[PDB]
């Protein structure tokens, strides 16, 4: 059987997870994808709105 979700890999976020895909429930045929990446010592969380 498949490994159990590590904490602190959160299943849901409400508003070590670096590079992980998060996404909103789809609505109006538009997809919202999210993830945090690292450039040297700087972090950015990118949201892509995509039909």
């Amino acid at each position: 059987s498949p490994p159990i979700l590590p904490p602190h890999l959160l299943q849901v976020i409400l508003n070590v997870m670096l590079n992980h895909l998060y996404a909103l429930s789809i609505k109006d045929s538009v997809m919202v994808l999210s993830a945090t990446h690292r450039y040297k010592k700087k972090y950015v969380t990118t949201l892509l709105y995509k039909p």
């Binding site: 059987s1 498949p2 490994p3 159990i4 979700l5 590590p6 890999l9 959160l10 299943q11 849901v12 976020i13 409400l14 508003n15 590079n19 992980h20 895909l21 998060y22 996404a23 909103l24 429930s25 997809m31 994808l33 999210s34 993830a35 990446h37 690292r38 990118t46 892509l48 995509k50």
Partner: protein, 100 residues
Amino acid sequence: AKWHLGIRSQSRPNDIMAEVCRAIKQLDYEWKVVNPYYLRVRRKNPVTSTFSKMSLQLYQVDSRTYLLDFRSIDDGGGGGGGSHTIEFFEMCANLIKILA
């Protein structure tokens, strides 16, 4: 806003890994099988000619439910001048589409 990690299913782990391999093949990405529950996938950009890699990992989150995890691989991919991050998001949106 409510953000969800990857995607969820209540199929059998084996069934699940079956469909993502099929979904992958459909896109014509190359993939490697590390574990029975861990896939490294590679893809060459038709426009930029660069390569982007990512991991698909299946976890158990429930007694009935499993979670497919997408993670970009920070390996000197990708763009381009594309965008490793954006191209990551696109590889995913495509797979999540073929599924569903």
